[PDB]
Amino acid sequence: MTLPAFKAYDIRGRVPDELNEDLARRIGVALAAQLDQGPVVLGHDVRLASPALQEALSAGLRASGRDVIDIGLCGTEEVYFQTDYLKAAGGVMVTASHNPMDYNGMKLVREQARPISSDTGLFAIRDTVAADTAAPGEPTASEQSRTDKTAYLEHLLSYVDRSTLKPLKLVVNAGNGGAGLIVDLLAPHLPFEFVRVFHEPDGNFPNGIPNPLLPENRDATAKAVKDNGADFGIAWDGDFDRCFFFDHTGRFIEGYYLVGLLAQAILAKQPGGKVVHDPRLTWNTVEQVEEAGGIPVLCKSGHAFIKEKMRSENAVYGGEMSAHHYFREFAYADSGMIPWLLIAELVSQSGRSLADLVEARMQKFPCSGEINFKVADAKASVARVMEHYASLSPELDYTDGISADFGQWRFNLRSSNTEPLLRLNVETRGDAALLETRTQEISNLLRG
Ligand SMILES: O=P(O)(O)C[C@H]1O[C@H](CO)[C@@H](O)[C@H](O)[C@H]1O
Ligand SMILES: [Mg+2]
Question: Measuring CA to CA, which residue among 59, 86, 52 is closest to residue 71?
Fold first, then answer.
């Protein structure tokens, strides 16, 4: 009874039965009715169908009197940046990010790149598109091509003092997504020596779909770091709004620890600022933010919640453990580029390896990583967990599912808003043994 491609935060589906040019044009028409006055920025990723879906979007938008600013093949963050920079009414990125070959999708924003989500306009668009049987009208507005990335590149470079950068050797792995175009445009302005892996955009994805979380894709970056003696490695998803770090030993760094690391990096430039973090893994971030003189602000996980809380708090930075990093001056939006520029500067200025910058934090606050469970009855499973631990009287917080703080250890257990899954995160106060026994205990209870 409902179009399956319309999800909580974006549109995503198999082409062509769940998403196609006709739906894309109808989405353009419906989006025009939902935005304030102004033109609409469109960009797309490397997938084979993405240009044609963008063209259909543009045709619907222009049939509805919206001028279209075509920024071309880009990363999702460039749609965010240009929507805000050009003071557009909104923007759409055509992308499936990390999904398989036969999938595509769209990420929609309104003014200042504010997200459009299921409860803030996306399901309104879905319902309009679902009932729209009108004949396609003809264009009454224009499309302008604006592929200049100069303002975007200057904005990225403004986060670091380039005279303090050292000629680090960096592995970069675009995964045949789009990140390599931006790296290559930044490189004339940077002293780094880049080691390029899976660098060329290829929507056929000959080296695997761009998802650095798959261990086999992870190992391509690790090996390049180790074989070339690189200072660290960076990998991106296909639309490069997520970045992933490998230290000089080839070790993939759990994203939890990048939140505290980037917060300290930013707070050095913006003293006393607020930093937004999610509730899944917290202790390390709270401590690092406070030690840097910042103020940590707890917020439900999900990019729309993070961005809204950052805005209401004038927070300079927000970070999620799931490799999303948000920057006030970047229209409160996430970037897969700003994070590694900041880390490169921190390594250059401190004389410490990425490994040593996080090592003590990982020992002090070891974490399970996010563990997902598909169970027969999520509500019953969660109840089994809470009944088992009731006699210990944990401190409970319901910001985002259930957070339970036992003193020396804590967990977060929540339902995903994008998949029918339970997600589990556990951390402890410097106790790897406790981390494992509690994680396994909860896992058995969930699976019971
Ligand atoms: O499925 P979940 O866990 O509700 C939402 C997931 O996707 C969101 C958008 O990519 C992320 O902001 C969030 O951190 C992540 O857990
Ligand atoms: Mg992505």
Answer: 86
